[PDB]
Structures are given as C-alpha cells and as structure tokens.
Amino acid sequence: IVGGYTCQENSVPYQVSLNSGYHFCGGSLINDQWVVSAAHCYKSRIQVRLGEHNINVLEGNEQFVNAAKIIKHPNFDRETYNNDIMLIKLSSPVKLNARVATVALPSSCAPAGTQCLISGWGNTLSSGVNEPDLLQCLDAPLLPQADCEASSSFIITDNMVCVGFLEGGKDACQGDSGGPVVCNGELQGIVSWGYGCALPDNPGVYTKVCNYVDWIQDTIAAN
Ligand SMILES: [Ca+2]
C-alpha cells in the first residue's frame, strides 16, 4: 500500500497473509474455513496466516493454517486478469475472535463514490520496492469507470472496478494482490492489478466481488 497509514494492530481482523516461505499476497476471511483472494495469487501450496500485524515478529495473535483446496475461478484469464478471484479452503477451521474475524460478502454492487478500506503488506513505494513489517491501510473510494480510464494507460472489464485516486500518491501495489477492499462492512473488491503504483491518472484495478457471490457460495457448498 503506497501512501497509506499503519493500521491499528489487528483492526482489520479479516485480513490474512498468503505465505510460501515469505508473504506474497493477501486474502480475506469469509467464514471460519474459507478465504477469498485473487486467482493470480495461486501457488501449488499456500500457508494462510491470520491474526497478523507485524508479519516478521510473533506478537501473540497469529494462527497459521495450510490451504487444503486452492480453487481459481474457472474463467480466470491470466492475460487480462478477468475473473481474478480464487477461494482457499483451510485444512482446519480457525478460532474466530476479536482479532481473527470474517467479513461479509456484498449484498449489491456498491456505487461510485462509496468510501472503502484497502489493506495489505504490499510494496509501499511508487518507485522501487519496500516491503513493510506492519499491515498498511488506505481509505479510498470506488471510482466511476469513465473517470478511471479518462487518462489512464488501460481499460477494465465489467468484472473489475477502479478504486483510489486519479491524482496518484495513494494506491495498492505488488504484494497487496488478493487483499480486501471493504466498504460499509462488505467485501466489494479484491486487489488485482494496475499500471505502476500510485501514479497520477492510473487508479488501481480490483476484482468486482459483487459479480461473484453465487460462484463463491456454490463453490463453498460443493466443497
Ligand atoms: Ca506476527
């Protein structure tokens, strides 16, 4: 997260870190045994880390659980990142508490202008790379598609939504991928891609979770 602020410790209880020997993506806890992330974050094996604040220091609220099933959306397109969503079923249910909690799925597609919270342990620089120890937060609004593409060097599909600032300076970045965009207590987006990070005229692009509520529920029920 570039241009954000350090989240208060465990203040984003649904935020998880996907780890394969190091942090590589984020995710969101949606029930005691399922995590939703981005399909581009797929790996053959993944350890899910919950209750984290400092990912490099054991602070006492961590729960590390291995992924049992890692299910990418069947229509995920690696070239365009269309349908960039994935479900992870944990090998065992986690213990839900104040610091490890679930986030609700969207009841509808939120409108442009809705204020949200984006979070993650991704790169904090708009140039170069800096991986933060502590979870970063960013208050950002959903943007109108037309506004987003006006002077950007990209376009988005109906399964994507731009979130952020047209002026740049504040945005998600590499390492935040798969993480949450929560608005009014509902997961409306998943960090997916962008052109650079925090660059003017190039807001971040996120998977529009409201288009996948049925797939998510069906998948969970089928497994
Ligand atoms: Ca820790």
Curated annotation (Swiss-Prot):
Its EC number is 3.4.21.4. Disulfide bonds join C7-C137, C25-C41, C109-C210, C116-C183, C148-C162, C173-C197. Binds 1 Ca(2+) ion per subunit. The record marks D171 as: Required for specificity. One of its GO terms (biological process) is digestion. It holds the Pfam family Trypsin. Its main location: secreted. It catalyses: Preferential cleavage: Arg-|-Xaa, Lys-|-Xaa. GO terms for cellular component: extracellular region; extracellular space. Ca(2+) binds at E52, N54, V57, E62. Keywords: Calcium, Digestion, Disulfide bond, Hydrolase, Metal-binding, Protease, Secreted, Serine protease, Signal, Zymogen. It is found in: Secreted, Extracellular space. GO terms for molecular function: calcium ion binding; serine-type endopeptidase activity. Residues 1-221 form the Peptidase S1 domain. Its cofactor is Ca(2+). CDD domains: Tryp_SPc. The active site is at H40, D84, S177. Belongs to the peptidase S1 family. This is Anionic trypsin-2. The lineage of its organism: Eukaryota, Metazoa, Chordata, Craniata, Vertebrata. The gene is Prss2.
